[PDB]
Amino acid sequence: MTEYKLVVVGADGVGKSALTIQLIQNHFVDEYDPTIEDSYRKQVVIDGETCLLDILDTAGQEEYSAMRDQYMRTGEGFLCVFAINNTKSFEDIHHYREQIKRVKDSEDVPMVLVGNKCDLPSRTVDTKQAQDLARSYGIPFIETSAKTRQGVDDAFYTLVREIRKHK
Amino acid sequence: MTEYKLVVVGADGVGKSALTIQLIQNHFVDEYDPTIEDSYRKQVVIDGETCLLDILDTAGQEEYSAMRDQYMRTGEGFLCVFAINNTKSFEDIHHYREQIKRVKDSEDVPMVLVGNKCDLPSRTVDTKQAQDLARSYGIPFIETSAKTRQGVDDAFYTLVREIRKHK
Ligand SMILES: Nc1nc2c(ncn2[C@@H]2O[C@H](COP(=O)(O)OP(=O)(O)CP(=O)(O)O)[C@@H](O)[C@H]2O)c(=O)[nH]1
Ligand SMILES: Nc1nc2c(ncn2[C@@H]2O[C@H](COP(=O)(O)OP(=O)(O)CP(=O)(O)O)[C@@H](O)[C@H]2O)c(=O)[nH]1
Ligand SMILES: CN1CCC(C)([C@]23NC(=O)c4ccccc4[C@H]2c2ccccc2N3)CC1
Ligand SMILES: [Mg+2]
Ligand SMILES: [Mg+2]
């Protein structure tokens, strides 16, 4: 059964863990428990194909930034997450992108830009600004909410589709 | 930082995932989503020492039995879980222990016998009988409930102490 190694990356607090847990447990976690490194395996059906998703939920805290090199070498696709109510998290996206491109030594790494917390009314990042950044990278952009589940399945399925295109 | 590699093993349905999620997230999962393989890295203080617990939540489905060798080699201590309302799960304990002993090529591997679902009134395994089994193995026995949190911290901390007391 085809396996896809997906890695969720982004600034500390954007909702990487909440997105992953919502996808896998169908449960929204309101608590903030900073992650070191957690991994999940889930069997799903995407476009009629049964897939195994190997999801790595990474640390946004810079304390654990030395762990990035190994997960970027093995990761097949990257979910690059920012929060729509956190200007700094959007600015931190390009750093994750640049690091992934450098480790992979490639410009066409499967990625999806995710603008999380779209359920909140405190927006500080314009959807247009995010769409434009995704165009400069030539990657899809999807807005999500780990709380309401808006766009969650779409963000992970799209990333799997990006890996399939690249194979 | 001292790291402890803990592996949660047992028959399908005993509550391995519910115990792990209760330990880490302090809530009880009513849903039954069979596990393939999930991992968690969590920082905790045990006996005044800051520890890193690497917890592997394994598959109880007998279909994934070929995956056991690798996690038994890597694992330092094993939480051997049965459910007090499932006699097959209690008898399956012997098979998990014999497999661990064989991979490790040792008779004294850190283990803790856990009798989960102790909140339920449908008991089929007497506490005395579980206690006698743990005594024959020379390991600690604790009854737990992933629902009420009874014995959960004690089961994981005791296993860390077994790894520590073995070193
Ligand atoms: N309203 C709302 N809150 C969210 C959403 N996603 C995550 N959160 C909240 O933001 C906080 C951080 O979520 P978390 O999943 O821990 O973020 P993280 O990026 O994994 C944190 P770390 O990098 O340290 O592991 C939590 O309080 C969580 O409930 C969302 O889509 N909507
Ligand atoms: N009453 C009660 N129910 C529990 C307890 N622990 C787990 N359960 C329940 O048993 C079912 C299976 O729990 P789960 O944690 O998935 O068990 P598992 O051993 O991980 C199953 P698998 O081996 O396939 O991964 C769920 O309905 C869950 O709510 C408990 O301590 N008490
Ligand atoms: C016991 N496994 C549990 C799964 C694992 C955490 C991790 N899976 C790997 O195969 C692997 C191999 C080398 C380095 C990193 C990894 C991880 C990885 C990266 C990207 C996406 C998923 C994911 N799964 C590794 C440890
Ligand atoms: Mg996290
Ligand atoms: Mg499980």
Author numbering:
A (entry chain B), B (entry chain A): 1 to 167
Give passages from the manuscript.
KRAS is the most frequently mutated oncogene and belongs to the protein family of small GTPases that function as binary molecular switches involved in cell signaling. Although KRAS could serve as an excellent target for many cancers, no therapeutic agent directly targeting RAS has been clinically approved. The shallow, polar pocket situated between the switch I and switch II region of KRAS (SI/II‐pocket) is of particular interest because it is present in the active, oncogenic form of KRAS.
To ensure that the shape complementarity between the rigid three‐dimensional topology of our “kinked” library and the KRAS protein were assessed accurately, we developed a “snugness‐of‐fit” scoring function. The “kinked” library was virtually screened in an analogous procedure to that used for the vDNP, with the addition of the “snugness of fit” scoring function for pose post‐processing. After visual inspection, 7 compounds were selected for NMR testing and the racemic compound 15 showed NMR cross peak shifts. Both enantiomers 15 R and 15 S docked with conserved indole binding modes; hence, the racemate 15 was separated into its two enantiomers 15 R (2R,3S) and 15 S (2S,3R).
